[PDB]
PDB file of N, CA and C and ligand atoms in Angstrom:
ATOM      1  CA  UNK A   1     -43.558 -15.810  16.325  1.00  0.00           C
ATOM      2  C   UNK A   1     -43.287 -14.272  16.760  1.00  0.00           C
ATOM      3  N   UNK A   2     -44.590 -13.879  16.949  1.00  0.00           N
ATOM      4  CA  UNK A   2     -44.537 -12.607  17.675  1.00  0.00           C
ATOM      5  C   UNK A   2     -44.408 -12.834  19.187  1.00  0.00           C
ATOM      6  N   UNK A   3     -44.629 -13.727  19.849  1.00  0.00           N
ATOM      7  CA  UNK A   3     -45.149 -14.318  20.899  1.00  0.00           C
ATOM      8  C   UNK A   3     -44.718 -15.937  21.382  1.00  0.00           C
ATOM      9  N   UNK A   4     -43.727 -16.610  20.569  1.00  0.00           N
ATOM     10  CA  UNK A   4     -43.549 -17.384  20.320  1.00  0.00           C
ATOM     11  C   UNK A   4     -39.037 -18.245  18.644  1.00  0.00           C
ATOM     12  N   UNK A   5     -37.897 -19.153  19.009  1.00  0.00           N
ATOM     13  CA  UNK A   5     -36.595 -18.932  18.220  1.00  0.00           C
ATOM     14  C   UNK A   5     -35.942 -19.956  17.806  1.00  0.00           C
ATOM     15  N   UNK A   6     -35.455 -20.546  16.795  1.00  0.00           N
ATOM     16  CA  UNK A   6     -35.285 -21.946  16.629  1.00  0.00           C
ATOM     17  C   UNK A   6     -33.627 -21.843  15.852  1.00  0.00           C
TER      18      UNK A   6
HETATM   19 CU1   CU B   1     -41.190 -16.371  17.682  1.00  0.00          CU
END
């Protein structure tokens, strides 16, 4: 993730 793209 919410907070945290790969
Ligand atoms: Cu994320």
């Amino acid at each position: 993730x919410a907070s945290x793209a790969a």
